[PDB]
From a paper:
Rad51 is an ATP-dependent DNA-binding protein that forms extended right-handed helical filaments on the 3′ single-stranded DNA (ssDNA) overhangs that are formed following end processing of DSBs. The Rad51 presynaptic complex is responsible for identifying a homologous double-stranded DNA (dsDNA) sequence that can be used as a template to guide repair of the damaged DNA, and it catalyzes a strand invasion reaction where it pairs the bound ssDNA with the complementary strand of the homologous dsDNA, resulting in displacement of the non–complementary DNA strand. Rad54 binds to the Rad51 presynaptic complex, drives the ATP-hydrolysis-dependent movement of the presynaptic complex along dsDNA during the search for sequence homology, and it greatly increases the efficiency of Rad51-mediated strand invasion. Rad54 is a required cofactor for Rad51 strand invasion activity, therefore, Hed1 binding downregulates the activity of Rad51 in meiosis by preventing interactions between Rad51 and Rad54.
We obtained a 3.3 Å resolution CyroEM structure of an S. cerevisiae Rad51 filament bound to a 96-nucleotide ssDNA fragment in the presence of ATP along with a 44 amino acid peptide encompassing residues T101 to L144 from Rad54. The Rad54 peptide decorates the outside surface of the Rad51 filament, and it is located on the opposite side of the nucleoprotein filament relative to the bound strand of ssDNA. Each Rad54 peptide interacts with a composite binding site formed by two adjacent Rad51 protomers within the nucleoprotein filament, corresponding to a buried surface area of 1651.4 Å2. The Rad54 peptide is composed of a N-terminal loop (amino acid residues R103 to A110), followed by a short helix (~1 turn; residues Q111 to D116), then another short helix (~3 turns; residues P117 to T126), and ends with a loop region (residues L127 to K136) that contains the FxxP motif and is located near the C-terminus of the peptide. Rad54 residues R103 to T126 interact with the Rad51 protomer facing toward the 3′ end of the ssDNA (shown in cyan) and residues R128 to K136 interact with the 5′ facing Rad51 protomer (shown in green). Close inspection of the structure reveals that the Rad54 peptide interacts with Rad51 primarily through a combination of hydrophobic and electrostatic contacts. Rad51 residues V140 to V145 form a hydrophobic pocket at the Rad51 protomer–protomer interface which interacts with leucine residues L113, L120, and L127 and isoleucine residues I123 from the Rad54 peptide. Rad51 residues G209 to G213 form a second hydrophobic pocket which interacts with the FxxP motif of Rad54. In addition to these hydrophobic contacts, the basic residues K105, R112, R119, R128, and R129 from Rad54 form a network of electrostatic interactions with Rad51 residues E212, E156, D149, E271, and N246.
Residue numbers in the entry:
A (entry chain E): 81 to 400
B (entry chain J), D (entry chain I), F (entry chain K): 103 to 136
C (entry chain D), E (entry chain F): 80 to 400
DNA sequence: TTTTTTTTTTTTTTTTTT
């Protein structure tokens, strides 16, 4: 819903441009935003803010809906194929739009390869399992490689030039820049249709930006704000969100019950914010193991997927 | 599948669906056993 | 309960009833429990009219002293909702209790949302088996509601999936103000049809980000106290079970080593004092989970083991052992 | 079990119970030892 | 790169610039990449002045989005440094890539320092033969640097030994603090004159002894993370190829029998994630050595054989076969 | 190959490049199939 | 012309060795 629909009942274009400069680009963003943040905007009065809130509430519903209608609505949600039948079976058709998916594991587990595969496959038509929309990439480690995108698009028969042109790329150098890039991303997705957002990696900058136990609270709260903004963007635009995370080995071997001494970074905030969590491990050769850790609707299981020059796929009999 | 399956605008353009939801919400409770 | 329409006596106009309904008061109990200040804050209400309304509400709703024997025999007839697990049912002494606040806290993948779904679907079965025979209301603050689980569990209990889905109301909150405002709509809805369960998953999710810094801590705590007071008042009015979900964080200050668990729930003292019963959840082996009663005015401290299967929460099987 | 066990309407609809409560409250104290 | 002197606009004084230079920031890119907190904590800068500096830096260098095609065509022109061996060039798809972190890990006597010595010379030959046409910087933490090898390698490539020795800067670190502090002088040196290669051999030579025990592990890991992050800023600023050498350790706990190699590089998750590319070295027969790619965002896993001779690292000869 | 390929000064010196990037980012989405 | 009252309220993990 365009924000220009708010140009009624004494609302001035200056108010709309101020809201756009403040990061709000759609009526849904205005509706979701609380009154406190609206009051923080310069040149906005309490009565004008109340009028804006009422107008937004009129445009988008916020009441109670029966479970049957919600179920039939979610039954039509778009799922993006990952190029592997095993992954699609484990995720029940692929990654789900409007939800946060996290991939965690050690290095050389192919998380970036899966991100590239998702970025390229978001452009193929729906009947094959795509999303038919542009992709947005935020890189925090300088590991983006367009060669993989070109090769994988060659696998799917897409035009490499169009595939490269339909993918937007950006790099963040600090936590503040990473948070600030979200405003530009929201503006771009308001001006044109997108389907996928990829963040690799979320916790790379926070490890060095914040120092000591004294700054732990600030780092955790900044991460919470970043994930809240990501979730707001996700349910505002309905695009899939994928984030990658690192791991750390726990020195204290007190919890010997868990055979794996590696746990993802971010702690409780990171664990609670993410809707779905997938852990990655390395097998033999090009094979890798993917395990669902947390999911509101999926059982715990494992799958095997291989990485080849054309991207992520099902393991071949030669690898068995 | 639809481009705007979860978009709130889909609910805005169908007042009949909202009326049906409101009617079903306040209809008298019954035992859900055949 | 007592409908508010009984207040249309002794010169009370229907416009006053409309004003009260618009102000959030929908039952005679709501008028009786409301203090003088809140009534005076309503536009178009005179002091004499407020006094007359208070007198009429007190006449209909008894508010005096009652001997403990009658209170005991009254509480002995409360409806308790089964959780689908006999091991967990024994610890609760018959299941969750209507007219009370139950809180579940723990880390992720501990099955709190699964238990909430099981309670939401089991409140419709006949009470002779352990149900409540009423509609359920769901408020989601994390976008984690999944009707597929409800359909599966309803299939487990031999219930019609269509009616089970139709008997559950669902809503999502995007900010603290909207979450608080949804209670008005919930109260309006329950005044027309019989409900038995209200679930909030999760209470503390939005307040963590909505209020920023140490300076805004007081406002956040005041808002949370207001929300919990509203929940308690609603439960008292309609006598429905209330279940809330809470998150947990690790206390970095490892100076005290007496408690082996370095994780404590979010909410501070307000959540601890307001909630009536508290249950902590931990992950066991496989699909098994551990539940522990932390605070309860009637139940002793103990632990229990349950499990999660495709058909919901239940007792662990010998295969998992 | 009753759907409105704790409802105030149950107490309001039974004046005899209220009269019994009032009578028991003001009855003289006795030692509860048999 | 844009010099910091261009920043003295719109009320910016020379005193602020000299204070920033004393603080370690020598380029406008350093100011742009610097977070607001770190810029503000420096004494002598106001919040408004810091905001003005950030705005000017954002104006000078781009920080927004860009299409993938333009990034790909820009990356296609990146300079790769030849290593003197055709097998290694084929394995790496051109040679050592500038602007990325390359790690060489393996046992002793495997020739890790030989590749660094070869790159110290090949970084000065003209671009047409895979060179860099820039000065080299060397950081030594084990007392292994030997100019004789550099002279021999320069003789192999036909470069003047005097010019080759004069075009390379050498420094030695004695502790972790000195190792980190050397980067401050290195940034100024590379800002005053053009450089193309930085070599660190080895990164964890001092960290193993400086920090001991489980209590000091967190501080050591954090210090290593800060060192690698500073290296990443430096590489991004100047676009010079960064090469680091690492040692190996034998895992006593043979629980993970799936891995036939009982030796793994030290550093843990920080070292694993920080490095963009990782190459493992093993000893072959005679002068032959085996190089294997472990982690690479764009290269497949493979192995190759390279020989070491008096003139440096090269392709194996038929006599050594 | 260029000595200042990945340097940020290259983009700042070509405003036409930035204008083309902005125009390409804002063009409407099309299916990348011939 | 006179003549003060009276506190609230918690956050939040890190990290291998041999
Ligand atoms: N072109 C390629 N062809 C085949 N395999 C490749 C190719 N590029 C990379 N790989 C494989 O992928 C691995 C690294 O993949 P990727 O970078 O996605 O891993 P990751 O675990 O997510 O890493 P990081 O933590 O560094 O981001 C390589 O070690 C290699 O096995
Ligand atoms: N259909 C299912 N069959 C089996 N296990 C399932 C099923 N759906 C979910 N699970 C399991 O239930 C767990 C997640 O439960 P739940 O969503 O209630 O988590 P939670 O601990 O309450 O966390 P949250 O804070 O994310 O709500 C996971 O272990 C998941 O594998
Ligand atoms: N002048 C030389 N001519 C030929 N071969 C040499 C010469 N100097 C060294 N070597 C070879 O190189 C080996 C040592 O190489 P180098 O010091 O690079 O190894 P390394 O594995 O990196 O060592 P470290 O772990 O001690 O740094 C010698 O054992 C020898 O085989
Ligand atoms: Mg990767
Ligand atoms: Mg979860
Ligand atoms: Mg849950
Ligand atoms: Mg208590
Ligand atoms: Mg040696
Ligand atoms: Mg050596
Ligand atoms: Mg890597």
């Amino acid at each position: 819903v365009p924000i220009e629909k708010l140009q009624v009942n004494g609302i001035t274009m200056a108010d709309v441009k101020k809201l756009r400069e403040s990061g709000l680009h759609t009526a849904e963003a205005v509706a979701y935003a609380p009154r406190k943040d609206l009051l923080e905007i310069k040149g906005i009065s309490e009565a004008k803010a109340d009028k804006l809130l009422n107008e937004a509430a009129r445009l988008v519903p916020m009441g109670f809906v029966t479970a049957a209608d919600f179920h039939m609505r979610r039954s039509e949600l778009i799922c993006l194929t990952t190029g592997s039948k095993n992954l699609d079976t484990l995720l029940g058709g692929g990654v789900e739009t409007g939800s946060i998916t996290e991939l965690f594991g050690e290095f050389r587990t192919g998380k970036s390869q899966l991100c590239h595969t998702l970025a390229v496959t978001c452009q193929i038509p729906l009947d094959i399992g795509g999303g038919e929309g542009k992709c947005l990439y935020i890189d925090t480690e300088g590991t983006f490689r367009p060669v993989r995108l070109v090769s994988i698009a060659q696998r799917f028969g897409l035009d490499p030039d169009d595939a490269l042109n339909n993918v937007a790329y950006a790099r963040a150098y600090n936590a503040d820049h990473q948070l600030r890039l979200l405003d530009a991303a929201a503006q771009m997705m308001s001006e044109s249709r997108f389907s996928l957002i990829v963040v690799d990696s979320v916790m790379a900058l926070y490890r060095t930006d914040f120092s000591g136990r004294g700054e732990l609270s600030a780092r955790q709260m900044h991460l919470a704000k970043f994930m809240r903004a990501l979730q707001r963007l996700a349910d505002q635009f309905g695009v899939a969100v994928v984030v990658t995370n690192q791991v750390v080995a726990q020195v204290d071997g007190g919890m010997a019950f868990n055979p794996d001494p590696k746990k993802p970074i971010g702690g409780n905030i990171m664990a609670h914010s993410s809707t779905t969590r997938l852990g990655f491990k390395k097998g033999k050769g090009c094979q890798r193991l993917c395990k669902v850790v947390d999911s509101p609707c999926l059982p715990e299981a494992e799958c095997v997927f291989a990485i080849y020059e054309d991207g992520v796929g099902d393991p071949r009999e030669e690898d068995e | 599948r639809r481009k705007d399956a979860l978009s709130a605008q889909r609910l805005a353009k169908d007042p009949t669906r909202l009326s049906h939801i409101q009617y079903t919400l306040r209809r008298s409770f019954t035992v859900p056993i055949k």
